Amino acid sequence: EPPPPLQAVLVADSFDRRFFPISKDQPRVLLPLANVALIDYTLEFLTATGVQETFVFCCWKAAQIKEHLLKSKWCRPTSLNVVRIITSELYRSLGDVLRDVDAKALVRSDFLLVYGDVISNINITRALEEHRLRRKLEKNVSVMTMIFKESSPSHPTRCHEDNVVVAVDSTTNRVLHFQKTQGLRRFAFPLSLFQGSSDGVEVRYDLLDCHISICSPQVAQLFTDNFDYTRDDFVRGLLVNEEILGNQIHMHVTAKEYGARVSNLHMYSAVCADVIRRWVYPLTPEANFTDSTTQSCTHSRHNIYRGPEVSLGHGSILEENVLLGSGTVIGSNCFITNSVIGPGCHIGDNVVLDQTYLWQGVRVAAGAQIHQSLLCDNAEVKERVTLKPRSVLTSQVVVGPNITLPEGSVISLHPPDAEEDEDVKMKGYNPAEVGAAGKGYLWKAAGMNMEEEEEMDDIKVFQNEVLGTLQRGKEENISCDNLVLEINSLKYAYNISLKEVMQVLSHVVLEFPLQQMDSPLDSSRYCALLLPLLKAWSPVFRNYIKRAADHLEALAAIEDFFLEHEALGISMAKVLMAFYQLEILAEETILSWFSQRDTTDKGQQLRKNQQLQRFIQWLKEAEEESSEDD
Amino acid sequence: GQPHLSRQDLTTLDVTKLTPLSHEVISRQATINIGTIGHVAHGKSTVVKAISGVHTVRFKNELERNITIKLGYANAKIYKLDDPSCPRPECYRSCGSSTPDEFPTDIPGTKGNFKLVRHVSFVDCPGHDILMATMLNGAAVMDAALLLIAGNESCPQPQTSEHLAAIEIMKLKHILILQNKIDLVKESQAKEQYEQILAFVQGTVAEGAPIIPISAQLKYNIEVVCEYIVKKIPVPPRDFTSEPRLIVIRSFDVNKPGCEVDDLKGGVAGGSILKGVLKVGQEIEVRPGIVSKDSEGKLMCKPIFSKIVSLFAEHNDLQYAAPGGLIGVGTKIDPTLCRADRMVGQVLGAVGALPEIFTELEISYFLLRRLLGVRTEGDKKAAKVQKLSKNEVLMVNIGSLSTGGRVSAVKADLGKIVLTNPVCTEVGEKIALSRRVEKHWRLIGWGQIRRGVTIKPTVD
Residue A244 CA to residue B101 CA, distance in Å, equals 39
3-state helix vs strand vs coil in chain A, percent to 5: 35, 20, 45
Q: What is the least distance, in Å, from the CA of B219 to any CA of chain A?
A: 29
Check CB contact under 8 Å for B63 and A218.
yes
* Number of other residues whose CB lies within 10 A of the CB of residue B53: 17
* Number of other residues whose CB lies within 10 A of the CB of residue A428: 6
Residues 6 or more apart whose CB falls under 8 angstroms from that of A331 comprise: A313, A316, A347, A348, A349, A350, A351, A366
Question: Distance between the two ends of chain A, CA-based, in angstroms?
Answer: 88
Residue B323 CA to residue B344 CA, distance in Å, equals 18
Question: For A400, left (φ over 0), alpha (ψ -120 to 50), or beta?
Answer: beta
**Which residue does chain B place closest to A95, by CA atoms?**
B420
- CA A79 to chain centroid: 38
Give me the amino acid identity at B381: K
CA R_g for chain A: 37
Q: Within an 8 Å CB–CB cutoff, is residue B40 touching chain A?
A: no
Residue A476 CA to residue A485 CA, distance in Å, equals 15
Q: Which whole-number Å values give the CA distances from B447 to B135, B403, B444, in the listed order?
A: 11, 15, 11
Q: Dihedrals φ, ψ of A96, to 5°? A: -65, -40
Residue B80 CA to residue B92 CA, distance in Å, equals 5
Residues 6 or more apart whose CB falls under 8 angstroms from that of A326 comprise: A294, A295, A296, A297, A307, A308, A309, A310, A343, A344
* Residue-by-residue DSSP string for A256-319: SS-EEE--SHHHHHHHHHHHHTTTTTT--TTT-TT--GGG--EEEGGGEEE-TT-EE-TT-EE-
Give me the amino acid identity at B323: P
The residues with which A69 forms a beta bridge, in sequence order, are none
| 3-state SS, residue A101 | helix
Q: Which long-range contacts (CB under 8 A, 24 or more apart) does B16-24 make?
A: B16/B240, B16/B241, B18/B240, B18/B277, B18/B322, B19/B235, B19/B240, B20/B235, B20/B236, B20/B237, B20/B238, B20/B324, B21/B118, B21/B235, B23/B101, B23/B116
Q: Which whole-number Å values give the CA distances from A2 to A5, A128, A132, A217, in the listed order?
A: 9, 14, 11, 17
CB B127 within 8 A of CB B397: no
CB A630 within 8 A of CB A590: no
Residues 6 or more apart whose CB falls under 8 angstroms from that of B379 comprise: none
Residues 6 or more apart whose CB falls under 8 angstroms from that of A179 comprise: A164, A165, A166, A187, A189
Q: Can you point out the beta strands (E) in A466-545? A: none
Residue A548 CA to residue A559 CA, distance in Å, equals 18
Please give the interface size between A and B, counted as residue pairs whose CB atoms are below 8 Å apart: 80
Comparing CB atoms, the residue among B297, B393, B404 nearest residue A89 is: B297
Q: Dihedrals φ, ψ of A541, to 5°? A: -65, -45
Give me the amino acid identity at A121: N
* Residue-by-residue DSSP string for B99-152: S-SEEE-SS-SSS-EEEEEEEEE--B-SSSHHHHHHSSS-TTS-SEEEEEEESS
Q: What is the least distance, in Å, from the CA of B290 to any CA of chain A?
A: 10
HSE (side-chain half, CA atoms, 13 Å) at A446? 13
**Which residue does chain B place closest to A470, by CA atoms?**
B369
Residue A430 CA to residue A416 CA, distance in Å, equals 12
Q: What single-letter DSSP state applies at residue A5?
A: P
Query: Which residue from A133, A128, A162 is spatially nearest to A145, judged by alpha carbons?
Result: A128
Q: Which whole-number Å values give the CA distances from B47 to A526, A587, B126, B180, in the listed order?
A: 57, 50, 14, 8
CA R_g for chain B: 23
Residues 6 or more apart whose CB falls under 8 angstroms from that of B24 comprise: B6, B7, B8
- Rounded-to-10 torsion of CA A224, A227, A233, A234: -20
Query: Which residue from B344, B318, B348 is spatially nearest to B332, judged by alpha carbons?
Result: B348
**Pairing relationship of beta strands A441-442 and A410-412 according to DSSP bridges:** antiparallel
* Angle at CA of residue B273, ends B341 and A100, nearest 5°: 30
| 3-state SS, residue B51 | helix
Q: Within an 8 Å CB–CB cutoff, is residue B104 touching chain A?
A: no
Q: What is the least distance, in Å, from the CA of B218 to any CA of chain A?
A: 28
The residues with which A336 forms a beta bridge, in sequence order, are A318, A353
CB A109 within 8 A of CB A4: yes
**Which residue does chain B place closest to A57, by CA atoms?**
B297
* Number of other residues whose CB lies within 10 A of the CB of residue B460: 3
Edge-to-edge strand ranges of the sheet holding A410-412 = A298-300, A304-306, A322-324, A340-341, A357-358, A374-375, A392-393, A410-412, A441-442
Check CB contact under 8 Å for A489 and B369.
no
Query: Which residue from B12, B31, B38, B1 is spatially nearest to B321, judged by alpha carbons?
Result: B31
Q: Dihedrals φ, ψ of B76, to 5°? A: -145, 130
Residue B365 CA to residue A151 CA, distance in Å, equals 51
Question: Distance between the two ends of chain B, CA-based, in angstroms?
Answer: 36
**Which residue does chain A place closest to B204, by CA atoms?**
A488
Chain B residues with CB inside 8 Å of A488's CB? 165, 168, 204
Q: Within an 8 Å CB–CB cutoff, is residue B67 touching chain A?
A: yes
Residue B141 CA to residue B35 CA, distance in Å, equals 9
Q: Within an 8 Å CB–CB cutoff, is residue B372 touching chain A?
A: yes
Check CB contact under 8 Å for A492 and B67.
no
Q: Dihedrals φ, ψ of A551, to 5°? A: -60, -35
What experimental approach yielded this model?
cryo-EM
Give me the amino acid identity at B58: R
Residues of A with CB under 8 A from a CB of B: 87-90, 92, 99-100, 103, 140, 218, 221, 225, 227-228, 240-241, 244-245, 465, 469, 472, 478-479, 482, 485-486, 488-490, 492-495, 497-498, 501
| 3-state SS, residue A608 | coil
Check CB contact under 8 Å for A100 and B293.
yes
| 3-state SS, residue A561 | helix
Mutate to test the interface with A, among B67, B161, B435, B436 (most CBs of A within 10 A): B161
CB A390 within 8 A of CB A407: yes
SS (H, E, C) A201-261: CCEECCEEEEEEEEECHHHHHHHHHCCCCCHHHHHHHHHHCCCCCCCEEEEEEECCCCEEE
SS (H, E, C) B154-184: CCCCCCCHHHHHHHHHCCCCCEEEEEECCCC
Binding-site annotation: residue ranges of B: 41-46, 180-183, 215-217
| Resolution stated for this PDB structure, in Å | 2.7
**Which residue does chain B place closest to A62, by CA atoms?**
B296
* Number of other residues whose CB lies within 10 A of the CB of residue A617: 10
Interface of B with A in 139-168 (CB under 8 A): 156, 160-161, 164-165, 168
Check CB contact under 8 Å for B161 and A244.
no
Residue A362 CA to residue A585 CA, distance in Å, equals 86
Q: Dihedrals φ, ψ of B116, to 5°? A: -60, 135
Check CB contact under 8 Å for A228 and B66.
no
CB B315 within 8 A of CB B58: yes
Comparing CB atoms, the residue among B65, B156, B293 nearest residue A495 is: B156
Q: Exposed, middle or buried, A159 (CB in 10 Å: 0-12/13-18/19+)?
A: middle
Residues 6 or more apart whose CB falls under 8 angstroms from that of B360 comprise: B408, B416, B417, B418, B419, B452, B453
Check CB contact under 8 Å for A493 and B156.
no
Check CB contact under 8 Å for B393 and A227.
yes
Q: Inter-axis angle of helices A523-536 and A572-581, to 10 degrees?
A: 20
Binding-site annotation: residue ranges of B for GTP: 41-46, 180-183, 215-217
Chain A residues with CB inside 8 Å of B436's CB? 228
Chain B residues with CB inside 8 Å of A241's CB? 439
| 3-state SS, residue A461 | helix
* Number of other residues whose CB lies within 10 A of the CB of residue A365: 19
Residue A399 CA to residue A431 CA, distance in Å, equals 9
Residues 6 or more apart whose CB falls under 8 angstroms from that of A448 comprise: A408, A410
HSE (side-chain half, CA atoms, 13 Å) at B378? 0
**Which residue does chain A place closest to B296, by CA atoms?**
A88
Check CB contact under 8 Å for B420 and A490.
no
The residues with which B396 forms a beta bridge, in sequence order, are B403
Interface of B with A in 292-311 (CB under 8 A): 293, 295-297, 299
Chain A residues with CB inside 8 Å of B404's CB? 227-228
Check CB contact under 8 Å for B203 and A218.
no
SS (H, E, C) B278-312: EECCCEEEEEEEEEEECCCCCEEEEEEEEEEEEEE
